[PDB]
Write an enzyme that holds these catalytic residues in place. Sequence first.
Site, PDB file in Angstrom:
ATOM      1  N   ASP A 175       1.235  11.759   1.228  1.00 46.49           N
ATOM      2  CA  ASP A 175      -0.410  12.096   1.361  1.00 46.49           C
ATOM      3  C   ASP A 175      -0.861  11.973   0.890  1.00 46.49           C
ATOM      4  O   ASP A 175      -0.683  13.607   0.357  1.00 46.49           O
ATOM      5  CB  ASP A 175       0.247  13.436   3.030  1.00 46.49           C
ATOM      6  N   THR A 176      -1.897  11.107   0.814  1.00 47.91           N
ATOM      7  CA  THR A 176      -3.251  11.811  -0.063  1.00 47.91           C
ATOM      8  C   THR A 176      -3.916  12.901   0.716  1.00 47.91           C
ATOM      9  O   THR A 176      -4.503  12.500   2.412  1.00 47.91           O
ATOM     10  CB  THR A 176      -4.100  10.891  -0.688  1.00 47.91           C
ATOM     11  N   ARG A 184       0.626   1.110   2.835  1.00 48.81           N
ATOM     12  CA  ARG A 184       0.113   2.393   3.139  1.00 48.81           C
ATOM     13  C   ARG A 184       1.440   3.123   2.604  1.00 48.81           C
ATOM     14  O   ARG A 184       1.757   2.451   2.847  1.00 48.81           O
ATOM     15  CB  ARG A 184      -0.129   2.821   4.620  1.00 48.81           C
ATOM     16  N   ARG A 234       0.054  -0.593   9.692  1.00 47.63           N
ATOM     17  CA  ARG A 234      -0.237  -1.518   7.778  1.00 47.63           C
ATOM     18  C   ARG A 234       1.335  -1.047   7.383  1.00 47.63           C
ATOM     19  O   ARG A 234       2.445  -1.108   7.979  1.00 47.63           O
ATOM     20  CB  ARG A 234      -0.192   0.360   7.484  1.00 47.63           C
ATOM     21  N   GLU A 243      -7.940  13.067   2.193  1.00 46.16           N
ATOM     22  CA  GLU A 243      -8.928  12.556   3.514  1.00 46.16           C
ATOM     23  C   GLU A 243     -10.244  12.177   1.905  1.00 46.16           C
ATOM     24  O   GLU A 243      -9.917  13.009   1.339  1.00 46.16           O
ATOM     25  CB  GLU A 243      -8.756  12.456   4.259  1.00 46.16           C
ATOM     26  N   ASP A 286      -3.903   6.950  -0.573  1.00 53.41           N
ATOM     27  CA  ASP A 286      -2.608   6.220  -0.353  1.00 53.41           C
ATOM     28  C   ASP A 286      -2.758   5.271   1.048  1.00 53.41           C
ATOM     29  O   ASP A 286      -1.277   4.776   1.080  1.00 53.41           O
ATOM     30  CB  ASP A 286      -1.649   7.100   0.123  1.00 53.41           C
TER      31      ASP A 286
END
Length: 130
Positions: free
Chosen positions: A35-36, A30, A76, A38, A16
């Site tokens: 949400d991917t 971002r 970001r 980690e 992401d």
Amino acid sequence: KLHKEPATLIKAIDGDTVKLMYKGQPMTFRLLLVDTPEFNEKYGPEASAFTKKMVENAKKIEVEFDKGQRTDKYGRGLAYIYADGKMKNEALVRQGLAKVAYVYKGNNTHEQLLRKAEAQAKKEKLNIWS
Ligand SMILES: Cc1cn([C@H]2C[C@H](OP(=O)(O)O)[C@@H](COP(=O)(O)O)O2)c(=O)[nH]c1=O
Ligand SMILES: [Ca+2]
């Protein structure tokens, strides 16, 4: 109404985040509203691979800011990112490689589009929903 703006790839980072050149300056972006996992988590590698492939193969990358904050507390950029017209944020959710997440008031234009993709990925039992 939001607007698409040009950018070029500098480097893939993970599911992401990505490094792009925007208005001539390098910036880490971002992806809004997702949400991917980690890289170190389950499906993290597959998410990172997916995003990498999508951005590296695109002939045209575009950045679309929402109505609200354009940079987060880490500096970001916060955007919807498009590869040859296809939204990366929506594509990751549709594939079960990200959850809809981090939905903050006033940067949430595409919330319902992404929830609809999540519902379909969950129905299909894809990846994270398997
Ligand atoms: C997606 C997004 C993340 N963030 C911040 C919230 C979280 O703060 P914390 O670092 O304190 O947990 C973090 C999650 O990003 P990551 O999932 O990349 O870690 O990024 C925002 O502020 N706005 C956003 O729109
Ligand atoms: Ca993440």
